[PDB]
Amino acid sequence: MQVLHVSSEMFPLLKTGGLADVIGALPAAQIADGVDARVLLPAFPDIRRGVTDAQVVSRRDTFAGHITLLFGHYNGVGIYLIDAPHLYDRPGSPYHDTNLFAYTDNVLRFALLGWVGAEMASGLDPFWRPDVVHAHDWHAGLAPAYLAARGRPAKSVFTVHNLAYQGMFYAHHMNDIQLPWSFFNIHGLEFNGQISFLKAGLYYADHITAVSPTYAREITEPQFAYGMEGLLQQRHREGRLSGVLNGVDEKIWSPETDLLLASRYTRDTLEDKAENKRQLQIAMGLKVDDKVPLFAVVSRLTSQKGLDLVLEALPGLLEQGGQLALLGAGDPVLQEGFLAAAAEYPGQVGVQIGYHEAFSHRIMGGADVILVPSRFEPCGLTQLYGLKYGTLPLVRRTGGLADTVSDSSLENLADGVASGFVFEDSNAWSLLRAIRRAFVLWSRPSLWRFVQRQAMAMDFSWQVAAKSYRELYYR
């Protein structure tokens, strides 16, 4: 089977969001799983620097200028690049000028991405054509549309990584992107008076995907849907809306090999995790002290994430002996409160304001618990890391989290399935209850170790996502 992924970025060559890890990690899983997967990306400069061996496949004109299709490999997976300097050769963020405004011609720039995707399905490359074009997020949102206009030469699945970015453009661009006029219709890429690459992808795709089974069900509810509820419910009725959980690259994230840690450890050497802790408390300003549970937060500081809730809970958490190390940024109000808390409880509350992937690993590897109290969770990733590192996640029961963590109930404990802590409601009382639960578990160290081994044993690798999508593709 032959899938072609169409996105706008790919770890590690270029990344601005979690989407790029998928594109960077899924296709290789697929390759090893019976699916011949390839990737089509704009030829952004540092996307291009990475593919040393690129060679020409075709030189063509376009409704947006001279493209020249290249092909080479990267870490063993086939990459196609749309070489189009007037469009793609730009320093700064591939999405905007130094002055932080989008590139006005962006519509042309990503319609192009879609169109090449669709063209691939019609044989733009004489040696290889995809059975399925897998389009990814609004950037590739038109690919399922161009496909439709070509009477669906290959099947298309579109996954939404960010229901939030609608990919809006003015209606009068209909005259530039070369799709059938009829497509600009509420039943089609029309959305609140404008074009929407997303509504496009959402409407035209043979089948749609969200990043988790439940967030898949979730977005059919109007609270979640950013106004796409109608379409979504329908695709659901029809059975062309499901969720597939994303994966975790063992190569980057994994306590056995993580070169960022004071000490690597395994599921049956958890005694080795202790220096990692010690070091963390140290590095963060916290009483070095192992008799006590260290709760971490590594997240954008926002309401969606639940940190207002963490802040309300804080005093209680501290009251019962715990400590908190936080690493993130976002809403001012929150930043204040957490600094205030550090000031108020120096030694047991330690707060870094900012962002820092290297340091997050040291956190992920030192902490005892990882707090993910989301009001809703589009990209349930943090908690997978926790599980993988044996640092038990405490999470709200929503999106990916609801699919990924097992509460430390007696049931789950005896069934050897418990892997963390869960709370139902989005208020501080219920969070506190899970916090309480954590201490109670903590105070029975052998059980704690029991649950960590369980967390660590769970398979949330890409090989899993691969199977899932493989199966999808054959339908």
For 1-248+459-475, CATH gives 3.40.50.2000
Contact 284, 325 (CB under 8 A): yes
Assess whether the previous peptide bond of 12 is cis (omega < 30° from 0). Answer: yes
Pair of tokens at residue 210: 């969200």
Instruction: Let me know if 289 is exposed, middle or buried by CB neighbors in 10 A (0-12, 13-18, 19+).
Output: middle
Tell me how crowded residue 294 is: count the other CB atoms within 10 A of its CB.
23
> From residue 259, how far is each of 127, 253, 361 by CA, in Å?
41, 10, 10
Which experimental method was this entry solved with?
X-ray
Domain ranges for the chain: 1-248+459-475, 249-458
Tell me how crowded residue 46 is: count the other CB atoms within 10 A of its CB.
11
Provide the residue count of the chain: 475
Category of 63 on φ-ψ map: left (φ > 0), alpha (ψ -120 to 50) or beta: alpha
Comparing 1-248+459-475 with 249-458, is the CATH topology the same? yes
d(Cα 219, Cα 325) in Å, to the nearest integer? 32
Instruction: Let me know if 76 is exposed, middle or buried by CB neighbors in 10 A (0-12, 13-18, 19+).
Output: exposed
Q: Which CATH architecture has domain 249-458?
A: 3-Layer(aba) Sandwich (3.40)
Name, in order, each residue with C-beta under 8 angstroms of 301's C-beta and a sequence gap of 6 or more.
307, 328, 329, 330, 331, 334, 335, 338
d(Cα 293, Cα 310) in Å, to the nearest integer? 16
For 423, phi and psi rounded to 5 degrees? -125, 145
Do the annotations mark residue 287 as ligand-binding?
no
Give me the residues paired with residue 135 across strands.
6, 158
Pair of tokens at residue 244: 């597939």
Q: Could you give the maximum distance between any two Cα atoms of the chain, in Å?
A: 68
Query: Helix/strand/coil (H, E, C) string of the chain?
Result: CEEEEECCCECCCECCCCHHHHHHHHHHHHHHCCCEEEEEEECCHHHHCCCCCCEEEEEECCCCCCEEEEEEEECCEEEEEEECHHHHCCCCECCECCCCCECCCHHHHHHHHHHHHHHHHCCCCCCCCCCEEEEECHHHCCHHHHHHHCCCCCEEEEEECCCCCCCEECHHHHHCCCCCHHHCCCCCCEECCEEEHHHHHHHHCCEEEECCHHHHHHCCCCCCCCCCHHHHHHHHHHCCEEECCCCCCCCCCCCCCCCCCCCCCCCCCHHHHHHHHHHHHHHHCCCCCCCCCEEEEECCECCCCCHHHHHHHHHHHHHCCCEEEEEECECHHHHHHHHHHHHHCCCCEEEEECCCHHHHHHHHHHCCEEEECCCCCCCCCHHHHHHHHCCEEEEECCHHHHHHCCECCHHHHHCCCCCEEEECCCCHHHHHHHHHHHHHHHCCHHHHHHHHHHHHHCCCCHHHHHHHHHHHHCC
d(Cα 40, Cα 54) in Å, to the nearest integer? 12
The amino acid that residue 10 corresponds to is M
Contact 339, 351 (CB under 8 A): yes
Tell me how crowded residue 375 is: count the other CB atoms within 10 A of its CB.
16
- The torsion angle over the Cα atoms of residues 389, 390, 391 and 394, rounded to 10 degrees, is 110
d(Cα 437, Cα 435) in Å, to the nearest integer? 5
d(Cα 472, Cα 67) in Å, to the nearest integer? 32
